[PDB]
Amino acid sequence: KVRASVKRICDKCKVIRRHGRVYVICENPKHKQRQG
Amino acid sequence: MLMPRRMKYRKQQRGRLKGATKGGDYVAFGDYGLVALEPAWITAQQIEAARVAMVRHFRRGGKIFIRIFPDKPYTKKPLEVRMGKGKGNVEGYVAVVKPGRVMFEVAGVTEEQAMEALRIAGHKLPIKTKIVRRDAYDEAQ
Amino acid sequence: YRLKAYYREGEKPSALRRAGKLPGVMYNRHLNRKVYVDLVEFDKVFRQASIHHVIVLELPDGQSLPTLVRQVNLDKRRRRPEHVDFFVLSDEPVEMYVPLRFVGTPAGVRAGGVLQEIHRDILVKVSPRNIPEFIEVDVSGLEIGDSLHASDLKLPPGVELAVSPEETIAAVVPPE
Amino acid sequence: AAAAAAAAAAAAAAAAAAAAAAAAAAAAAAAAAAAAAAAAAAAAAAAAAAAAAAAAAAAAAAAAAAAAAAAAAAAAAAAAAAAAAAAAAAAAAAAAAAAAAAAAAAAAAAAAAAAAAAAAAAAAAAAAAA
RNA sequence: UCGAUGUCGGCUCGUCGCAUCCUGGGGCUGAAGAAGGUCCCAAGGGUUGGGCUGUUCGCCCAUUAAAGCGGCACGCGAGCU
RNA sequence: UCGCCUCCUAAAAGGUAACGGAGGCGCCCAAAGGUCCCCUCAGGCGGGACGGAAAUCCGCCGGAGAGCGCAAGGGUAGAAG
RNA sequence: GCUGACUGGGGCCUGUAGAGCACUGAUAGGGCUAGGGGGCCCACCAGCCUACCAAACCCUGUCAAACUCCGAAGGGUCCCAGGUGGAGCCUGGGAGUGAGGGCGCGAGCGAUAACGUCCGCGUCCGAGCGCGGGAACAACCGAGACCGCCAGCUAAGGCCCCCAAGUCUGGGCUAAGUGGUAAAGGAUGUGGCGCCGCGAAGACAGCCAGUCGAGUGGCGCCGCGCCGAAAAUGAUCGGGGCUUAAGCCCAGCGCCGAAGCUGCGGGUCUGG
Fold this sequence. Notes:
part of a larger assembly; 4 chains; A: 4-stranded mixed sheet; D: little secondary structure; rRNA-binding (chain B); Ribosomal_uL16_bact-type (chain B); Ribosomal_uL16_dom (chain B); structural constituent of ribosome (chain B); tRNA binding (chain B)
């Protein structure tokens, strides 16, 4: 979730900048990360 | 842990870090290096930690070459004490490292495993690192 | 293996470097000249030729000198070549290194061990008109115990062993 | 585009000399497909049959390789098929139209058929091969 | 600062910070429900009465939605003790 | 801890501080002094009854790593031994 | 009475920076290998083996204030030149000081902490809290204030308003108010240079692979920005307010600007 190192965790996961912030979204929600 | 077997002198002065590496700057053994990008004292505990991670990664696998060696003693006064009363006690040992020193090296491994292993180690080190290959590092004739 | 060289007069090496050029010199018993080459083109070459194989330098007077490298000095930080030494050959026999062919793989595998190419190449006396491409080794029964050293080689014509010859060349050793 | 060298010698050297081909249409093959027509389909013509659409995609340029002038009618398609540059075939013409009638549902349609200097059209191969 | 800057804690009076103990949002959950865990946003308001020790703090009793942690010269003696 | 000597710190003249690093001195020799004349070390490899891994003997190899009362440094066999 | 600092040329003296491993030690990997441990295995004492401890020797790699085969820049000194300076040398009278401080560089101590502490070379404050810049501010930048001027030229630093002088010119970046002060580390944020994959053997991404008809991927250099970033009275880059800038990088022209320099008058002290 909220960490200073966001990386891709798997190949379904996906890195998305939205509104100033770097997120990540996978298919499975455990993989969801936001940078902070 | 990782220290000399003898020293001529038990404690020694801190000194400084002029640029460059002097030597130990090109590959020489294995097929992939981890190189220094900044000067620092690297402590035996760090060297060891990195080294172990390397192996742990390609578990019991290829070969490893530790190219820096902590000969320098690291003093430190007891806790809570004031100044004076001679130099402090020796706590550990460091290896003086300066940009372009090839600190590690690996052999008998895939580039994938290697790339990765090293990266990992670079994390355990308190300085910035780069990975290397085997270019014009062949000082011959 | 050819490289456009140029003639260096007295332009600060710094500025040449700055401008992607690689300062240098060429010499032999007879000639001595400041030269420069371009970096990326030299590297393209050297990446293969290195000190093992001849390079032909094309000066601005059309002439084409057959040379070997004798030295690549480099800046520790920003690990790049600062300066190249070129030895222009002629006919007198000259010393150099010649690459080896580590055939197959060694039999030391059960104990986790791994090969050590202690010598990828060997020093030899040769004439410029009889330069070999390579030398052929025979690695197969290199176990976790034994190794090989000396004149256990397939020395062709034009060659003279300019080593010990008693000296270790490739040894298989335990894992990390 | 390094790949065109081992190719631009064999759609006017292979696709130019033959004797007896025809057209089928293997299309929507679901889980029943792996690579077994480049691994057992030779049993139709000895050392001959295969599985490819090579020069069956820019076939406006393959209808200029064996000299055939005026090029706009068929040629492309999922042209699966199998004949050969040196192989025999004749007696399957009555068995032919059984794989589009009910053994499948429609998908054994044809387009061309080079009967050694005798190309057959659509119903001109469906009435001919009967 | 020694031709003086009263120097623990208690009381009284507050005010601020958020790294939030309740209360309001929310995402993950090894989230069935209920109840947790964990992180994210959020101080607006709240954050008890006793036994023991000068105590700070702490342990304990009975509660509680909760019984937060800090700064203000270890806030506050020309306000008291 | 307090005087004296050696080394480093001391930034290539000299000098250079700290409760910086690390050692010595408060003696000794009637020959360990003067001069003249001789002689050359430590090791290493052989080889030799008692004989260790150096007792004394022989032969090669050995520019100095021996030795110069004692700390260190400098010096030194073309001798200071 | 020209000998001074400083400078030029010549000649000595030197063991740091750097570098090096020849000595003194430390040290990685490999080979060879005295001993020793230990397996084979026996007392007839030999003998074979060891991905064990381990001298010397060999190959390849390193480290050092109290190591040096080597060694700068500089420094000290004598000679001979320049050098008339609030220089020097000599004899005597009068002192105050003997508590330093910061900054830069070089070391030690310290924790490669401190407006720390101890020396060394330099510099300023001290005594220049007089003047200009830096928002304010002994010692950072500029510059050594005898007095006067409603004159002029510059210094640092400045030219959108406060506030003197450019909303000056030409080319780029940046979209965070970054600028307007933080790290490991993260990211399909941007821009600019590089070099390879491999594309009518027309799948890079999308529905059965045919259609689809092209650009796709992977590294490497460089610039600017994003998150990483939580503390206590009311905030804020000095403030207003700045977005092809009033930010940042690169070019250039002009102006502003001190008690610096000139001009003009005056005073005083020295020498002529």
